[PDB]
């Protein structure tokens, strides 16, 4: 629960925080070791690691992936690659 949370937030989902691509990271939410008081906190915590995984996936997808030739601003472009470059350091 301790390391597994850091694993899930870091970009390494376990089988505690079950990664879906239609609901991001979501905690199991059906077991007797999470209670309604804890439930809101867990849901609040899942979203940040979801954002982190999507950010890293975007950066690896769009920097250093072509040998340059194509005209596109959503899939390609030096400025998009520069966005990934700034985004990782932030």
């Amino acid at each position: 629960m301790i390391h597994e949370l850091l694993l899930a937030l870091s970009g390494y989902p376990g089988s505690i925080f079950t990664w879906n691509k239609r609901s991001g990271l979501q905690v199991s939410q059906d077991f007797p070791f999470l209670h309604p008081s804890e439930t809101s906190v867990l849901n609040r915590l899942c979203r940040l690691g979801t954002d982190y995984i999507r950010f890293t996936e975007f950066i690896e997808q769009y920097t250093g992936h072509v040998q340059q030739q194509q005209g596109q601003g959503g899939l390609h472009g030096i400025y998009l690659r520069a966005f990934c470059t700034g985004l990782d350091s932030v």
Partner: protein, 81 residues
């Protein structure tokens, strides 16, 4: 061209170190036939090569001086003989 393609990314220094040594042998080819009249080629990576002595054949690089090396080397090569 791969240099200017990634002239700003993190693969700019790595490819710079690659290009710095991949142009090393060809410049050494040039510095023989221009200054000593000794024609150096290795595998056919040098396009220029050498009856009244002007029936010899011909076969990024700036094309303004490509044709000039062909006479600049043959002159020095004839003064050797």
């Amino acid at each position: 061209q791969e240099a200017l393609h990634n002239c700003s990314n993190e693969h700019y220094p790595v490819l710079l170190s690659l290009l710095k040594t991949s142009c090393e042998p060809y410049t050494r080819f040039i510095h023989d036939w221009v200054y000593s009249g000794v024609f150096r080629d290795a595998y056919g990576e040098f396009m220029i090569q050498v009856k009244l002595y002007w029936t010899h054949g011909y076969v990024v690089f700036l094309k303004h001086i490509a044709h000039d090396i062909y006479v600049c080397g043959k002159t020095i090569n004839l003064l050797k003989l």
